[PDB]
Amino acid sequence: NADNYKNVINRTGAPQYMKDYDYDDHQRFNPFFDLGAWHGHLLPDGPNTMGGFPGVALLTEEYINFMASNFDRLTVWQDGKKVDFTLEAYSIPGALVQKLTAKDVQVEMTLRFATPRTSLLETKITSNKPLDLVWDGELLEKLEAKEGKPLSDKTIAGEYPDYQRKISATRDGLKVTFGKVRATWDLLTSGESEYQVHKSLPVQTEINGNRFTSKAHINGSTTLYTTYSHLLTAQEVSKEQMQIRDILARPAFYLTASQQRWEEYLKKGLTNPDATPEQTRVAVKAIETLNGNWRSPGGAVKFNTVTPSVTGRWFSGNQTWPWDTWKQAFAMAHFNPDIAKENIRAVFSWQIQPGDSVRPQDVGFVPDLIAWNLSPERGGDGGNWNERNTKPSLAAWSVMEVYNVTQDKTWVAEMYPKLVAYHDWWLRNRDHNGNGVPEYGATRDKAHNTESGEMLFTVKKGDKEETQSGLNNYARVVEKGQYDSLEIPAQVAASWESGRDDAAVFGFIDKEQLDKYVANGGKRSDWTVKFAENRSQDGTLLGYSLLQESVDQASYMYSDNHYLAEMATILGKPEEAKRYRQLAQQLADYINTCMFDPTTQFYYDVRIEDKPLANGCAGKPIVERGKGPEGWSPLFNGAATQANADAVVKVMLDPKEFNTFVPLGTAALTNPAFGADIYWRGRVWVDQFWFGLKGMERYGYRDDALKLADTFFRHAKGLTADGPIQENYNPLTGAQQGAPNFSWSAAHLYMLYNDFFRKQ
Ligand SMILES: OC[C@H]1O[C@H](O)[C@H](O)[C@@H](O)[C@H]1O
Numbered sequence: 001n002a003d004n005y006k007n008v009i010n011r012t013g014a015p016q017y018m019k020d021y022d023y024d025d026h027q028r029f030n031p032f033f034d035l036g037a038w039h040g041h042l043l044p045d046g047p048n049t050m051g052g053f054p055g056v057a058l059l060t061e062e063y064i065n066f067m068a069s070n071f072d073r074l075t076v077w078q079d080g081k082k083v084d085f086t087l088e089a090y091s092i093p094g095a096l097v098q099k100l101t102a103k104d105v106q107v108e109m110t111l112r113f114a115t116p117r118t119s120l121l122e123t124k125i126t127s128n129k130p131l132d133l134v135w136d137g138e139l140l141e142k143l144e145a146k147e148g149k150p151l152s153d154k155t156i157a158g159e160y161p162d163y164q165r166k167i168s169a170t171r172d173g174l175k176v177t178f179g180k181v182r183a184t185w186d187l188l189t190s191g192e193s194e195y196q197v198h199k200s201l202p203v204q205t206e207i208n209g210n211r212f213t214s215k216a217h218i219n220g221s222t223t224l225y226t227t228y229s230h231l232l233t234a235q236e237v238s239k240e241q242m243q244i245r246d247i248l249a250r251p252a253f254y255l256t257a258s259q260q261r262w263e264e265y266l267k268k269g270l271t272n273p274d275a276t277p278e279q280t281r282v283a284v285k286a287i288e289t290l291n292g293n294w295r296s297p298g299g300a301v302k303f304n305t306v307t308p309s310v311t312g313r314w315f316s317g318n319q320t321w322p323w324d325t326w327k328q329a330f331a332m333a334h335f336n337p338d339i340a341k342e343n344i345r346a347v348f349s350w351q352i353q354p355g356d357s358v359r360p361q362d363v364g365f366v367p368d369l370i371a372w373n374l375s376p377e378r379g380g381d382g383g384n385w386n387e388r389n390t391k392p393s394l395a396a397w398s399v400m401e402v403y404n405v406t407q408d409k410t411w412v413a414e415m416y417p418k419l420v421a422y423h424d425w426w427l428r429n430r431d432h433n434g435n436g437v438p439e440y441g442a443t444r445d446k447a448h449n450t451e452s453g454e455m456l457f458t459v460k461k462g463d464k465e466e467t468q469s470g471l472n473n474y475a476r477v478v479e480k481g482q483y484d485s486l487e488i489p490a491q492v493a494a495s496w497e498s499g500r501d502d503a504a505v506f507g508f509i510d511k512e513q514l515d516k517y518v519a520n521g522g523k524r525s526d527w528t529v530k531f532a533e534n535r536s537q538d539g540t541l542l543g544y545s546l547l548q549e550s551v552d553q554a555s556y557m558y559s560d561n562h563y564l565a566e567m568a569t570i571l572g573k574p575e576e577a578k579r580y581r582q583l584a585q586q587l588a589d590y591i592n593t594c595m596f597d598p599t600t601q602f603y604y605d606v607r608i609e610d611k612p613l614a615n616g617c618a619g620k621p622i623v624e625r626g627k628g629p630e631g632w633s634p635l636f637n638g639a640a641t642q643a644n645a646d647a648v649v650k651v652m653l654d655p656k657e658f659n660t661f662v663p664l665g666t667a668a669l670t671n672p673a674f675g676a677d678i679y680w681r682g683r684v685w686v687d688q689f690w691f692g693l694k695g696m697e698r699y700g701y702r703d704d705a706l707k708l709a710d711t712f713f714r715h716a717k718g719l720t721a722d723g724p725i726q727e728n729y730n731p732l733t734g735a736q737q738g739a740p741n742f743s744w745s746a747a748h749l750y751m752l753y754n755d756f757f758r759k760q
């Protein structure tokens with residue numbers, strides 16, 4: 001099956017910089033990674049890379065960095081003369097292949113992954129006469145470029161004097177050793193990491209600084225085997241040696257293992273017979289993308305996980321977020337369920353337990369960002385690890401999907417208490433007014449407050465910065481309004497927790513947009529989101545909340561309650577199931593009564609006003625900040641009444657609202673803060689789009705949902721091309737932006753393939 005999908009993504013490239021970046025700082029080539037390995041490979045594109053797989057990409061704990069352009073490139077010689085080959089090179093799901101053809105000699109090279117640290121190259125050589133073989137390689141010297149043009153003349157050695165890269169011959173090949181570099185935002189190594197090459201035949205190696213040449217002589221047709229291993233600790237180095245020996249001992253077994261695993265991914269995953277060839281290839285792109293972004297256990301993360309992008313500036317290593325994980329595992333349930341399960345475990349593996357040394361007041365909390373290196377507060381030197389906030393919860397929905405496929409009740413039994421702990425955490429620490437409807441917010445944190453628990457903030461006016469603390473001073477300053485801006489680190493983290501950091505609904509709007517809003521009759525203060533601290537009975541600071549209840553978050557809580565009810569029933573916990581059923585019903589009633597505007601016939605967030613409404617709602621729908629994708633969150637999540645869903649579907653299909661060139665973007669055309677190129681105020685994301693389609697389907701509009709899917713398929717740029725998957729689309733032009741090889745989009749493109757794409 002794999003052979004039907006050659007070059008689904010362009011995996012060619014010959015990088016010349018460690019940071020061979022695109023416009024947005026992401027590695028501009030798309031290397032092949034598999035088995036959760038910590039290195040990857042590209043295809044040759046021409047005579048200068050022919051005979052090897054260039055662009056060895058190392059995952060240095062939390063980042064992707066290229067090591068070399070050519071490394072272990074084969075040239076062949078027969079009687080003192082170099083054999084001139086022609087090249088055919090291609091990817092398939094699970095392998096890179098290149099075929100070299102000359103008259104008297106042919107070579108077939110197949111590169112697959114054998115372990116979580118090691119790839120295996122088969123070099124199959126056909127020749128009726130003896131040959132001399134030569135392998136060469138060279139470490140990169142130059143640091144950084146953008147769009148192929150250097151940003152500076154900085155060198156790698158120059159930038160990182162302790163990196164101390166050295167190539168050494170071994171008893172069975174060679175190795176590259178690396179010094180300890182703790183460059184928190186660029187390059188992380190242990191001082192014990194290595195890149196090892198082991199081969200099945202004796203070789204003779206000459207080393208010349210950062211280049212090498214290796215030689216061997218063979219007597220005729222022969223198949224050689226070479227392992228490539230990026231090993232990040234002393235203990236990884238030690239443990240891998242017996243694996244590498246087994247691989248060179250049983251190479252066919254490892255090749256077959258990979259072939260079969262990939263046939264299984266494709267068999268299990270490609271289950272929409274109505275889909276066209278083009279549509280199915282999109283699903284294969286998503287499968288290759290997701291599987292490449294999977295990482296084995298590494299550092300503090302003791303489970304397999306999946307990151308938003310192995311090639312991403314800030315998304316590589318094993319950096320893992322919960323929001324991304326829910327959708328990732330939802331999709332991967334349908335083709336790589338074992339890793340879907342692991343990914344969810346990874347996220348809950350650092351869930352806060354009672355007695356936690358940093359935040360005992362956050363039991364059940366799930367960190368925003370986990371990674372190889374713990375933060376200084378937990379004993380590591382990691383800059384990325386984040387516990388300032390979490391992300392919106394579709395955890396139960398994610399877990400349930402894994403169950404739907406596997407029917408594995410032991411999986412439900414495992415996750416249920418962890419899901420319940422997160423649930424209970426939301427209700428304790430993100431419910432400022434105590435009404436059972438959550439807010440987006442932030443934790444108590446060194447970045448957010450003093451040691452005594454006084455919320456930090458910085459008032460700005462012209463060029464004067466005034467840094468104060470305490471919720472007393474914040475209220476006193478908000479009223480006056482004699483500031484250009486008010487920076488509240490805890491409110492920044494609340495925007496991160498919402499998952500949509502410049503959204504209209506959360507008060508984000510540009511200067512010219514606001515002027516027009518005011519000229520049309522509104523007030524500037526309509527766009528001010530107020531902020532509050534959350535405390536327990538005894539006065540313990542639990543964290544913070546936006547003084548605003550979000551309709552998407554409420555709907556996700558409805559989801560959580562609905563799916564916990566089903567899990568409780570599966571597990572034979574009827575009384576707990578009944579409680580969640582009632583909580584679900586309570587949220588649905590609140591969402592429908594409080595958040596659905598009778599007048600505009602659409603859903604919106606509500607403010608937590610100074611006093612609740614007579615009907616018990618926290619405040620009125622925030623109609624004036626305009627319509628967004630949160631308005632269909634109740635449909636996707638199943639909270640809406642039929643009447644309210646019918647109304648919302650009318651708006652979604654309205655070409656003056658959301659039925660744009662690429663439909664269902666992150667702000668209606670009528671939104672006062674709309675911008676086609678703004679991430680969370682116009683741009684179309686595949687998750688929010690798919691939530692829309694599912695929401696429509698649930699309330700009887702599958703036919704219209706299938707039409708929108710067709711429109712997406714015809715209008716979203718690059719979909720049928722061989723480019724890597726990115727983050728979002730301009731709703732007017734269809735133009736793509738964001739990180740290449742983006743898991744979240746791949747997840748929902750896969751879902752669209754399964755649920756809505758079809759032959760017209
Ligand atoms: O560093 C944490 C940070 O990472 C990325 O920037 C995300 O987009 C934010 O929401 C936040 O999680």
Ligand SMILES: [Ca+2]
Binds near residue numbers: 433437439
């Ligand atoms: Ca509340």
